[PDB]
Amino acid sequence: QLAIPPRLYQICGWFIPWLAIASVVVLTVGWIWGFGFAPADYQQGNSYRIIYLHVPAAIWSMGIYASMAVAAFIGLVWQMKMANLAVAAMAPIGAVFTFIALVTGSAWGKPMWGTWWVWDARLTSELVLLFLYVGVIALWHAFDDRRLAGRAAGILVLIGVVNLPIIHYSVEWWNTLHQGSTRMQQSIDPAMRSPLRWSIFGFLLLSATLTLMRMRNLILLMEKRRPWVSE
Amino acid sequence: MGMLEARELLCERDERTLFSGLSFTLNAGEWVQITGSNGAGKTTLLRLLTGLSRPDAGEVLWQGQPLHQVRDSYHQNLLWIGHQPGIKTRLTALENLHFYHRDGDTAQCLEALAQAGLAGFEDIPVNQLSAGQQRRVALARLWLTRATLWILDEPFTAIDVNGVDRLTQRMAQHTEQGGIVILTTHQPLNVAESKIRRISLT
Amino acid sequence: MGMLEARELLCERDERTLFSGLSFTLNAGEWVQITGSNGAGKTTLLRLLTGLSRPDAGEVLWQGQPLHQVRDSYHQNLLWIGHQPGIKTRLTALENLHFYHRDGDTAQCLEALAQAGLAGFEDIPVNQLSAGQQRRVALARLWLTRATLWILDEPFTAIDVNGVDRLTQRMAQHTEQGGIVILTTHQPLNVAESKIRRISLT
Amino acid sequence: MTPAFASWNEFFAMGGYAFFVWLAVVMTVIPLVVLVVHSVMQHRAILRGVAQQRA
Amino acid sequence: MMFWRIFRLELRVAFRHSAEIANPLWFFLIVITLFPLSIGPEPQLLARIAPGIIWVAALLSSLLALERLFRDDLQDGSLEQLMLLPLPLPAVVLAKVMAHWMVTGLPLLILSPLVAMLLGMDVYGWQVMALTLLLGTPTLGFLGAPGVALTVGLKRGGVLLSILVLPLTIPLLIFATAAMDAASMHLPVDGYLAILGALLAGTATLSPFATAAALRISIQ
Amino acid sequence: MMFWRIFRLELRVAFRHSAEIANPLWFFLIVITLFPLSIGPEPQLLARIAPGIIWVAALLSSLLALERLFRDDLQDGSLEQLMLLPLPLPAVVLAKVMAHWMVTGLPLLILSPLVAMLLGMDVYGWQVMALTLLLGTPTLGFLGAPGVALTVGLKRGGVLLSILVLPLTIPLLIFATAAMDAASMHLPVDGYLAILGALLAGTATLSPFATAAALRISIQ
Ligand SMILES: Nc1ncnc2c1ncn2[C@@H]1O[C@H](COP(=O)(O)OP(=O)(O)NP(=O)(O)O)[C@@H](O)[C@H]1O
Ligand SMILES: Nc1ncnc2c1ncn2[C@@H]1O[C@H](COP(=O)(O)OP(=O)(O)NP(=O)(O)O)[C@@H](O)[C@H]1O
Ligand SMILES: [Mg+2]
Ligand SMILES: [Mg+2]
């Protein structure tokens, strides 16, 4: 059963503490397993430990945008208020993950490429995604009247997620056209696979906690006038 | 019976509720006026009636069906002139009104503008017309449209005392033909009280 | 001798001459209404008076010097509110009114906003104000400004009876001390006939 | 129990790629901590903003 | 009411908004002329960057011209079309987009023979460029329609519209420049025109509905 | 009155929330990234095209912000400043163009270090890029103001009104790109920097008067 009154504020506040504790514990375990306990790659040595910082961010940059698309779809067909606040709740987190992926990707390629920005498939497919996130965030912050930002934001998110596979495939083909190919398909090592899983799961829980807190903030911003905020 | 009907319309904007539990039926020949100050939801109610905006609660019914199901047979019988006139400023008066006419045009659009009071300004760009003559361009549609339902939002915004008389006489003979006029204005009507049906935003 | 004194003003749009030969001097404490049909040179005369537009053939004198020769001693004491209210639609009701005040203490701006009947809408963006609350934002400056000459062009365009009565009382008491109000209204004013000096377009 | 680095920050904290690895750590910790602090401060400021309008 | 009546009405309105539809053309000419001046008398480098600069100029010209698609409607007459004209709103959006393209994308195709000689292209290069502009500018209009429909109420002509639709045109730019570059080698280009046509067919169907939904959101 | 109040008012009209300040930065980033997707990822080629790319971005931003400058105010409040505000209309125009440069010119100057490595230029290239984006970008608001004021406010205006906005800024772009190319070639740039200083002194002295006269003529 789904009622979804601003009782959802209490439900969100119920999950934040345990979710935050679990996320912190998982991230710490996954980053102590790496960064000192996992083996080292033979080619690029200790620079390969950035996988635990870049792979989770890159994966969840797409994951959060997919969740935003699902939330926008739910809030469009069924005209649900809170399902449209879910887009604005996860948009800044997705933008931050895209920025983190971009930063950790460039600092990862600096030892090999020699410069801080080589136009690669990985680092540009995560740049158009950052552009989409920025567009959504800017659109949500430009409507004076709420309940219009969130429907317009939902429409923008749906339009972007329709175009997202096309853009990614075009970029993955654009790289093949000019350079002939990228360097090589990055491989994984069995002794260095579990810490990556744990770091990805930790990033998942961290994004969940962050979006719960942001959803609480947005719910208060929406119903800043109702008598149920008499507290 | 029940050409147009409102079914428990609710519209609340932020800390204020505009109206609650509105339920009125409008048969043929009704001259309905919305009453309120500059804060009540008169334009909001009219835009809920036209289908441009969706009500938070309740629904509007045309002839017995919701507005989203008959949105092709409803706009056939409908006439909205809101606070904004809805006419292109850079075009002349004729082709702005030529757009809204189905058939027989440029023989009847000239006659309508003559009745509105723009005889000789049919070929002058609207942006070069006065602030009141710009309203008369939009109000000239009252002499062309065959629509049964007129929903006007302050048609006497900047209309001369002579002009308001002609509009009042226009939407007084349209009614006994079998039309419906939903009016909202602040200047008093120059007609008897029995002719007008006041409804308030309770 | 005396404030604004139009001298044999002439202006013609297209081919018709709107007016030819106005010569009126407006001394202190006169309430004057520019009467005319919907299409005469009412707004055009007002823009000639405010100095925004140059007369076709003639000159208008403030305090003895033409309006291009002073341009600083005249805009200090002048308050024109035309058909367009002149308010930025994206800002709120406060910082928009804050711009037109001398310093904007926000103690007199709030007092004026509550005085014009727009109490409680002091922080809503003005584009969300309905249709006359937008005009009330523009007309709230009648309580802030110390200007001694008001060129008001159709201020009762979308204001209910209460707001019209309040504005009429404010203008009546302002013109009592030293003020001058040039007014163009199609709704007849509910004040004694001796108070208003009407001038027609000849 | 068994580290991939033999010793303390003499051996750890630089593996030949100290500037590049520790740039990623610092510049991923900073945005996340900024997000957390911003969310907490935003919630508290919204709550203080509720009581101020009760005046 | 009818589709063609709205199309002709918007053409008539756009032809009276002169000096606002000529600014995109001037910007296009300035952009396509600046770079051949930045590079000196070097023919080899010009033939490598000509497709890219041409299509970036086309993107930016369409971005400039997209401002007036729905701008002068919300003030007066964005409704009277949602509110009347029993023709479905997607069809109204289609008519408006067709009329906008006939004054935005069509002029860039008319000046294409004057560009292929300015940049020293051959006949086949101009043929491919014309086929690309003919199949690319309708896609530009259809993709830019939802972005201006969402931001028509915001009343900010500028950067906000340019960060909503510009990322959506990236595949169009990539494939268009790929086709034009492959034309320089006198290699058959049927594999890229097919992708451009697929993009045009895909956007020409969903964009009217997306823009209608956005306009309905923005009108309330 | 209080010219600075006009300046702060125009600043407020653009930005209402702290997160909306960064919109020009993202617009600039997207416009810059539009070129490598078309020209190619090769870094040496992008170094020679950097001046054209950045100045096309600056011109596009100035064009987009110029429409907001006067066309919006005409509908409601382009008056109440000729009629009020006892300070001369040239001062009002000066406030307008200064706020326009703050919303347009400043963000690209702030983003100058970031956009200098995406294109691959060195420190000298970035230095000359900053000195030309600080000394020539303010002009774009100045000499483009008289042109736009006539077009957006003169009813029944022909195409000739658009000849005073885009084709009037060609010398600015020509000298700026020549200076930047001389910078990339490692040549003395002061010969072109002294020229661009004269235009800034030459247009900031007369453009406010010219735009004031244009507004006076057009409002009538
Ligand atoms: N550019 C123009 N702007 C305004 N009026 C114009 C223009 N060109 C010609 N005119 C004519 O000027 C005459 C007077 O216009 P205006 O001054 O607006 O009249 P008004 O009687 O004040 N209008 P209103 O307030 O609605 O009753 C009309 O016949 C117009 O058509
Ligand atoms: N976006 C909005 N548009 C219009 N009204 C809004 C909006 N947001 C909130 N409102 C409120 O809607 C209420 C009613 O507006 P509206 O229906 O236009 O009133 P009205 O009585 O028709 N106005 P008026 O014609 O001047 O007498 C006002 O109290 C507004 O503050
Ligand atoms: Mg109303
Ligand atoms: Mg008038």
Numbering used by the authors:
A (entry chain C): 7 to 237
B (entry chain E), C (entry chain A): -1 to 200
D (entry chain D): 1 to 55
E (entry chain F), F (entry chain B): 1 to 220
What did the study's authors say about this model?
The cytochrome c maturation system I, consisting of eight membrane proteins (CcmABCDEFGH), results in the attachment of heme to cysteine residues of cytochrome c proteins. Our cryo-EM structures reveal that CcmA2B2 form a homodimer which is an ABC transporter analog. CcmC which harbors the heme-binding site is attached to two CcmBs with two coupling helices TM4 and TM5 on CcmC, respectively.
We describe high resolution cryo-EM structures of CcmABCD in an unbound form, in complex with inhibitor AMP-PNP, and in complex with ATP and heme. Only one major conformation is obtained for CcmABCD in complex with the ATP homolog AMP-PNP which shows a “full closed” inward-facing conformation. Our structures also reveal substantial conformational changes upon binding of ATP (to CcmA) and heme (to CcmC): closed NBD conformation when bound with two inorganic phosphates, two ATPs or two AMP-PNPs; open NBD conformation when it is ligand-free; and semi-open NBD when bound with one ATP.
